[PDB]
């Protein structure tokens, strides 16, 4: 009969709920059997390995559960006794959970996740991605760079095909892109930096503390990932230039709220640089850059021309320009690099790819 | 994943030669055994299914072959007994070979191809193709539109996750894309359509007869495919408005060389269109619109603000915009939608996806 694959999910946040929904709704010829779901301490564990009885509302089911969440080692031991191939869907961003990735992998358990942690830390844990071992499951992380856009898979494909990436540059942060699309445009603009980031925060786009977006470390993580798949064995997300948008004097301030009240005090610079670029009929963008030839990598601001693909983005789109041996002219892929629905579809799509390979 | 699979390639032309080279020279965790190298009159065929012993120089091998190419009814009669899954790679524009797809699939053999034929035919073939019945070959055609750009596989994924396409539209023809990107730009120019069509020809962007490109027919078949992938049951590439760039009729009435030389008599029309639109800060582009709600697939010229990305294309690149319930703001993918090595990569990309799935 039907081919089955058992799924174990950790986290039911914004991305995790979208994923679960889409997952439980997905029509297909392969059977995606939800056997586990974990959110904080409460957890649904189908000891039997039959589909979790979520009835028609896994939310309530997850609520009324009194099954404590299994310690990680116990999570592996459990999963290891499944009648079918297991796929762990880590919807968290816990570097803790990321520490067990290689343990999960090495025990035949596969992984699909938007979690950037394991993939943008030391090179040897990344090297662990070399799951060519016969006893370990697969590792997919599309939602890890650019939500659900056909990016990492497109690189792995052409590369295997025989192509060679040369230069990759793009916009990998939703928040940062939104800010720059609202701040630096093609038309006359008198908007202050402090205000755009002030609003992005209010709409709920920035992290609880926007300083966590402005230090450009999250894009540096994504860049670290693209750079590696691209052949530039980047040591860490911090081992290369990364321009911080945070005013040095506001680097050590008590609250995310003191930051916002005080930030206004430094519009000066960017207001001028924004202007300067206006004169040159250019725009300002926060990008990541990977130059395979010179093994150089970096993230920061850069002025782009109006006819440039990067000057024509909507809302908070992400963008990635891919230049390769056969692609003299970049393949440039653009679209939403954040949002629950979009991202979950990325995680699930990796679920699909993996379940077929099983 | 799956250790061993058999590749049955048909056609060693522009695309075909590049595919072969790339395949043969590919290093992977899976073994791809070439069990067939078929051409117009002669074919290389591994009667007992051993890897065709054609190291890297297959041409010399094919050449010395006097083994006549097997009619498709006999061919699949052979391949169907293969001890390993069989991936038929059709690198032809053959309607003949296309008519057979349904039989390959029913006999359990998958298909990887850039051949638009079976997918821009009647609705029954399409349904049959994706009937996705047990033990039946899978059918991949990433190269039928946009060469090797991640679009078809992107759509089939987003759709499976649960997303719905609402508005697709793109520049699916390199020769046309080239002409217009050249013809009408943001920077006003005194360029005559006829002069661009002819230069494009001399530079080889065209087919011996530029009418084979101006009739907008290839753009129609490519949109018939996307339309269907999106939920519009298009009866055929000829069941909707398909504006021709050929000087209104006056088609059959002439011939090759004459068409061109006489073409420079209608320019005034298009030149005027290029002007008016220019007044609106817009440009001209030959596209393939696709509206799902209204279920309206069209083809022809359309205006685009300079701001728009369809307005800043490079060389003869392809573009496609994808609005969905989830991506309310279009996912734009642009890049070479033609080219020996890029088109072939797209085909081998599908091969990899299929081998992995078997
Ligand atoms: N080269 C490209 O860039 C490109 C080409 N394709 C598709 O790729 C396929 C092959 O292309 P290509 O190699 O250039 O054409 P070839 O003329 O070289 O044909 C390949 C071989 O097929 C063999 N053949 C025909 N019938 C056969 C049979 N019954 N048995 C065995 N062998 C047989 C012939 O002997 C021939 O040598 C076509 O279906 C084409 O439509 C797919 C997409 C792109 C492209 O977007 C496009 O088609 C549009 C156009 N190029 C544009 O510029 O906009
Ligand atoms: Na992605
Ligand atoms: Na494509």
From Swiss-Prot, chains A, B:
GO MF terms held by the record: homoserine dehydrogenase activity; NAD+ binding; NADP binding
Active site residues per record: 222 (proton donor)
Residues reported in the UniProt entry to bind Na(+): 142, 145, 147, 149
pH dependence: Optimum pH is 7.5 in the forward direction. Optimum pH is 9.5 in the reverse direction.
A Pfam family recorded for this sequence: NAD_binding_3
Catalytic activity from the UniProt record: L-homoserine + NADP(+) = L-aspartate 4-semialdehyde + NADPH + H(+); L-homoserine + NAD(+) = L-aspartate 4-semialdehyde + NADH + H(+)
Any single biological process term in GO: aspartate family amino acid biosynthetic process
EC number(s) from the headed UniProt entry: 1.1.1.3
Cross-link (Glycyl lysine isopeptide (Lys-Gly) (interchain with G-Cter in ubiquitin)): 289
Binding site for NAD(+): 12, 14-15, 40, 92, 339
InterPro entries: Asp/hSer_DH_NAD-bd, Bifunc_Aspkin/hSer_DH, HDH_cat, HDH_CS, HDH_short, NAD(P)-bd_dom_sf
Remarks, miscellaneous: Present with 48900 molecules/cell in log phase SD medium.
Name of the protein in its database record: Homoserine dehydrogenase
Species the sequence originates in: Saccharomyces cerevisiae (strain ATCC 204508 / S288c)
Phylogenetic lineage: Eukaryota, Fungi, Dikarya, Ascomycota, Saccharomycotina
Gene name of the record: HOM6
């Amino acid at each position: 009969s039907t081919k089955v694959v058992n799924v174990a999910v950790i986290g039911a946040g914004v991305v995790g709920s979208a994923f679960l929904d889409q997952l439980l709704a997905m029509k297909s010829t392969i059977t995606y059997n939800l056997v586990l779901l974990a959110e904080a301490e409460r957890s649904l564990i189908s000891k039997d390995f039959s589909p979790l009885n979520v009835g028609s509302d896994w939310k309530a089911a997850l609520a009324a559960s009194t099954t404590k969440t299994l310690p990680l080692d116990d999570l592996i031991a459990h999963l290891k006794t499944s009648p079918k191939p297991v796929i762990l869907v880590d919807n968290t961003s816990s570097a803790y959970i990321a520490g067990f990735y290689t343990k999960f992998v090495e025990n035949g358990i596969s992984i699909a996740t938007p979690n950037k942690k394991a993939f943008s830390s030391d090179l040897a844990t990344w090297k662990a991605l070399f799951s060519n071992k016969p006893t370990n499951g697969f590792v997919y992380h599309e939602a890890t760079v650019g939500a659900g856009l056909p990016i990492i898979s497109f690189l792995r494909e052409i590369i295997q095909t025989g192509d060679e990436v040369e230069k990759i540059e793009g916009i990998f942060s939703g928040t940062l892109s939104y800010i720059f699309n609202e701040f630096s445009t093609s038309q006359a603009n008198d908007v202050k930096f402090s205000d755009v980031v002030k609003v992005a925060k209010k709409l709920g786009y920035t992290e609880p503390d926007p300083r966590d977006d402005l230090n450009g470390l999250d894009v540096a993580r994504k860049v670290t990932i693209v750079g590696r798949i691209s052949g530039v064995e980047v040591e860490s997300p911090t081992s290369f230039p990364v321009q911080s948008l945070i005013p040095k004097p506001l680097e050590s301030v008590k609250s995310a709220d003191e930051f916002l009240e005080k930030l206004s005090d430094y519009d000066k610079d960017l207001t001028q640089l924004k202007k300067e670029a206006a004169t040159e009929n250019k725009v300002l963008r926060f990008i990541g850059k990977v130059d395979v030839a010179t093994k150089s990598v970096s993230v920061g601001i850069e002025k782009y021309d109006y006819s440039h693909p990067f000057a024509s983005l909507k809302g908070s789109d992400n963008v990635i320009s891919i230049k390769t041996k056969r692609y003299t002219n970049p393949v440039v892929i653009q679209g939403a690099g954040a949002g629950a629905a979009v991202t979950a579809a990325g995680v699930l799509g990796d679920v699909i790819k993996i379940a077929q390979r099983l």
